């Protein structure tokens, strides 16, 4: 029987979070650090995310705005730099690891002057300002939250969207069930689990897409656009 929730795989919630915090504190503040030794796939990733996002930027009644985005689990700002800053007037970043947000100020260069808020906080403790963001981008971090905290964070995110705003999740997906990585202290969830969580947060899918051109050995990665 596959596991269907984090409550089947997490022995101790406080340790699940504290171990993850310690893990990221000892990762170098680099693209290869953000990508777990896969820094080389960054351009494939960014190109695909851009195309995915541009779907929602077309003129018409539901056009997503371009005033402000929120990068969640932003790290040093890999995605902020190459995807979001070019498209959004301002960007806010949130991440638990202070050293990454400090590095971001260097990594982002001159364009980084348009990063407004650098929030150093776990997502589980973060309440984005209501009616503030056109796009909330959540990539390679949902496995760090329990199902309850993920559902709650998504509800809070919903409350922070501007009219026509969207949430984008892009992350590793398991073929089946909920799989614990006890080294980085994270989980990988199957598509049915993630969709369940999204539904419980009062959100709906606008689109879902598998990431192409990835190394064969890694978990499949999917993007979901939500409102």
């Amino acid at each position: 029987v596959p596991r269907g929730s984090t409550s089947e795989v997490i022995e101790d919630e406080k340790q699940f979070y504290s171990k993850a915090k310690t893990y990221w504190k000892q990762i170098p503040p680099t693209v290869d650090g953000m990508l777990g030794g896969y820094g080389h796939i960054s351009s494939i990733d960014i190109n695909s995310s851009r195309k995915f996002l541009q779907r929602f930027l077309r003129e018409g009644p539901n056009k997503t705005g371009t005033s402000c985005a929120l990068d969640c689990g932003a790290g040093i700002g890999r995605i902020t730099k190459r995807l979001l800053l070019p498209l959004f007037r301002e960007v806010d970043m949130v991440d638990i690891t202070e050293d990454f947000l400090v590095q971001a100020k260097t990594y982002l260069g001159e364009e980084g002057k348009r990063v407004r808020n650098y929030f150093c906080c776990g997502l589980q403790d973060f309440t984005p300002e209501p009616d503030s963001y056109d796009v909330i981008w959540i990539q390679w971090v949902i496995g760090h939250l329990t199902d309850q905290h993920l559902a709650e964070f998504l509800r809070r995110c919903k409350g922070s969207l501007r009219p026509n705003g969207i949430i984008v999740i892009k992350d590793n997906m398991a073929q089946e069930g909920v799989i614990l990585d006890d080294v980085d202290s994270s989980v990988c969830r199957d598509l049915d689990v993630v969709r369940r969580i999204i539904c419980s947060a009062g959100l709906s899918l606008l689109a879902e897409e598998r990431q192409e051109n990835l190394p064969d050995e890694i978990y499949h990665v999917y993007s979901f656009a939500l409102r």
């Binding site: 990508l35 777990g36 896969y38 050995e217 890694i218 978990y219």
Partner: peptide, 6 residues
């Protein structure tokens, strides 16, 4: 991050 299937 992206990672090898365990």
């Amino acid at each position: 991050p992206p990672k090898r299937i365990a």
